[model samples]
Target chain A: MARKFFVGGNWKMNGSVESIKSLVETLNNAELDPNVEVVIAPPAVYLPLVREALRKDIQVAAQNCYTKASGAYTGEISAEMLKDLGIPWVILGHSERRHIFGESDELVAEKTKYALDSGLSVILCIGETLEEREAGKTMDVVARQLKAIADKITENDWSKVVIAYEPVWAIGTGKVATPEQAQEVHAEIRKWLAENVSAEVAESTRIIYGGSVNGGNCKELAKQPDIDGFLVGGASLKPEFVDIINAKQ
Target chain B: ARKFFVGGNWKMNGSVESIKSLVETLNNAELDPNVEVVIAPPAVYLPLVREALRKDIQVAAQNCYTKASGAYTGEISAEMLKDLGIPWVILGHSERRHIFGESDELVAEKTKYALDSGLSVILCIGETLEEREAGKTMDVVARQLKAIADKITENDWSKVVIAYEPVWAIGTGKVATPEQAQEVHAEIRKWLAENVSAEVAESTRIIYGGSVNGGNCKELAKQPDIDGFLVGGASLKPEFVDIINAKQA
Candidate 1:
C-alpha cells in the first residue's frame, strides 16, 4: 500500500491581504508536484481569500477550530463554518495551541472528533516538548496524545486524518529533526496505529514531519521510509516551499 | 449622549456565503438613526463583510493578538486587522477568558496593542455564574477592567467600549433585571471615575452583552447606564435590526 505525499504550509498567524495576495500568486504560478497533496493553512480570515485565488490543485486549511458547531464562543472558528466555506481541512493540536494556549490533549481530541464529524479532514498534530523528550518520555507523551483521539473516534476516522509529528522543541526554534529521528517516531506511530486500529490503516495513513523543515532539508526528511511528507513552518512562506512540495523524488 | 452603540458579535459562527446573505440582509434593513451600529463577525468574514456591509453599520473582529506578527500560529495579530482596514475588535470575551484561558494581563495587553495598532476595542468584562453567585460580580468585573486600565492610557479610553457581558448571562437565555444591569454599569462607570477621570467615565460608552435579543432589548436599552449592547447569538438574525433600534423611541 502507498500513501500520497502531503506538504502543508502552516502560515500561522502571519500575512496580511497584500502579502497573502503575493504568496497566492507565487503558488498559483509555481510548477508544483502533481503527486503531492499541498495544503496551506492561513489565519482563518484568509481561508476564503486564499481558496478563491489559489489554483484548484492546491487546497486551503484553517490553522485551528473550536469543538462546537456554533455558539457564543468568541474568537473561535468552527468546523461547520469551515465546511460551509468549502475548506476541507483543519490543523488541530498544533504545539502552539497545546502549550501557548493551554489546550489539553483531551480538548485537542475533542476538536479533532468534531472536525471529522463536520466532514472536514484533520491534520492532527502531536509531539513531545523539550522537557518531555529529555526526560525520555517522548513516546509516552505522543502515545498519550494519540490515545486521547483514538478513544474518541473510530478507526475508520483515521482515513480522514493526516498525522503531523511536530516536536515542540523544534517548532519555530530552527531545530529540524534528523531524518533518522523523524523516521523512528513516524515508524513508532505507524506501529501504534497498526496495533490500536488496523494494519490497513497504519499502511495507508500519511504521517508527516514538522518542526523547522525547509527546502535544504525537506528532501532528506521526505526520503524517510515512514515520513510521508512535511508540515512546513516559516519556510513555507518563501519560494522554498515549492521545493519542499516537490521533494518527493 | 443622544446616540447608542449596538454591536452584534456573531462569535464563532457563519460562513462566507451565509455572511454574504447576512450582509445583504443587514444592508436592506432600516436601522435607527440614534444607534451607532457595529457587527463583529468571525475573522473569516471580516474583509468580506467590511467591504459588503454598509459603512454606517461597522465591522469588527471577534478578537486579536497583541503582537504585530510572527510565529504565533493560529493567532491573528491586531496589526493585521488594522491593515485590513478593520476598525473594531472585541477583546477578553468570556469565551476567550473561561474557555480559552486568556489571562487578564494578556487581554489587557491585547487591548493596548490593538489600540496602539490603531484599532478600536470592545473590551468585555463580567463575572461568571459562580463568581456572581459568590456575590463577587463587581469584584470580578473590576479586576478585569483594572487590568486593561493598567496597561492603557486615559487617551486609549476614547477608542474603547466596555461591554459588561456576565458569563452567566451569555448563551443561557438569562437576562439581568433592568436595575441589576444598571447597577453593574453604574458601578463600572464609578470605578472609571474614581480610578481614571470623570471625563472618561462620562464620555466612554458602557454596554450590556450576551443573550440579548429583540424581545428583551428594549428594556435593557432603557437603562440609563446601559448605553448600548454587544449582542451574541441574536446578532446573526434579522431580529438583530430590532435590537439595534431598541433605543429609537
Candidate 2:
C-alpha cells in the first residue's frame, strides 16, 4: 500500500499578514514534489489570505480548531467553522497545544473526530514529552493518545487523518530526531495501529514526524520507511521550507 | 457617565461570507448614535471584518494571549491585535474558563497585557450554573473582578469594559430576567465603586451577554444597570444588526 507523501508547515503562533503573504508566494513559486501533498498552517488570522495566495496543489490548514461546530467558545475556532470556510485540514494535538494550552488526549481526540465528521481532514499529532521519553514512557504516552482517537473516531477512513509523532523534547530545542530513533517510534505506532485498529490502517495511514524539522534533516527522516513526511516548526517560516517539501526527491 | 455600548461576539462561528454579510447589515442599519458598537469576530476573520465593516463599528478579537510573541501555538496576542489596528479583545469568557480551563489569574494576566499593549478589553466575569443556583453569583463575579483589579491599576481600568455574562444563561436560552441581570449588574457596579475607584465604577460599562436576541433585547436594554450586550448566537445572524442598534430597537 502506498501513502501519498505529506509535508505540513506548522507556522505556529508567529507571522503577520504581510509576512505570511511572502511565505505563500515562496511556496507557490517553488518547485515542490508533485508526488508530495503540501499543507501550510499559518496563524489562523492569516489563513484566508494564505488560502487566497496558495496554488491549487498546495492546501492550507488551521493550526488548531475547537471540538464543536460553533457557539460560545470565544477564543476557539471549531472544525465546522474551518470546514465551512473551505479550510480542508486542521492540525490537532500539537505539543504546544498539549503543554501550553492544556488540551488533554481526550479533548484532542474529540476534536479529531469532530473535524473528520465535519468533512475536514485532520493532522492528528501525538507526541511524548522529554520527561516521558527519559522515563521510557514514549510508546505508553502515544498509545494513550491514539487510544483516545481509536475510541472516538469510528466513522472515517484513517486516511482522513495523518498521525504526526512530534517528540516534545525535540520541538524548538534545536534537536532533530535521529533517523533511526524516529523510525523506531514511527514503526512502533504503525504496529500499534495494526494490532489495535486494523491492518489496512497500519499500512495506509501516513505517520509523519514533527519538531525541529528543517531542510537539512528532512531528507534523512523522509527516507525512513515509516516516516512519510514532516510537520516543520520554526523552519516553516523560512524559504528553505520549499526544500523540505521536496525532500522526497 | 457611560454611553450605551453593545458588542456582538460572533464566538467560534461564521464563515468569511457570513461575517461579511453581518457587517453589511450593520453598515446599512439605522443605529442610535449614542450607542458605541464593537464586534468581535474570530481571530481568523479579524482582518476581513475590520476591513469590510464601517469605521464607527470598531473590530475586536474574541480572545488573545497574555504574551505579545512566543512559541505558544494556536494563540493570537494582544500585541498582534495592536499591530493590526484591532482595538479590543474579550478576556476571561466563561467558555474559556469552564471548557478550556482558563483561570481567573490567567484572564487577569491577559487583560493587563492587552490593556498595556494599548488595546481595550471586554473583561468577562461570571459564575457557573452551579454557582448561580448556590446563590454565590455575586461572590463569584466579585472574585473574578478582583483578580483583574489586582493586576490592573486604577488608570488601566479606563481601558476595560466589564461584561457580566452569567455562564448558565450564555447559550441555554435562559436569559436572566431584566431584573436578574440588573440586580447582578448593579451589584458589580457597586463592587467596582468599593474596590477599584468611585470614578472608575461610575464611568465603566457593564454589559449583559447570553441569549440576547432582538425581541428580548428591548426589555433588557431598558434596564439602567444593563449598559449593553455581548451577544452570542444572535451575533452571527442579521438580527445582530438589531442587537448592535439595540438602543433604537
**TM-score per candidate, chains pooled:** 0.96, 0.92
lDDT of 2 at A111: 86
Query: What fraction of the reference structure's interface contacts does model 1 contain?
Result: 0.82
In model 1, the runs with Cα more than 4 Å from the true position are A172-176, B171-174
| Model 2 per-residue lDDT tens digits across residues B172-231 | 656679998999999999999999899998999999976789888888998998999988
lDDT of model number 1: 0.88
A1-249 per-residue lDDT for model 2 (tens digits):
899899998887787767777877887788878999988887787777787788978888998998887776788888766776688989999888998889999999888888888888889999898788889999999899999999987734577989999878776565656889899999999999999999989998999988678878887788889998898888889999999988978
For every candidate, give the share of true A-B contacts it also has: 0.82, 0.75
lDDT to native, each model: 0.88, 0.86
Candidate 2 matches the true fold with a TM-score of 0.92
Worst 10 residues of 1 chain A by lDDT: A169-178
iRMSD for every model: 1.2, 1.4
Shift of residue A11 alpha carbon in model 2, Å: 0.6
Cα error, candidate 2, residue B225 (Å): 3.1
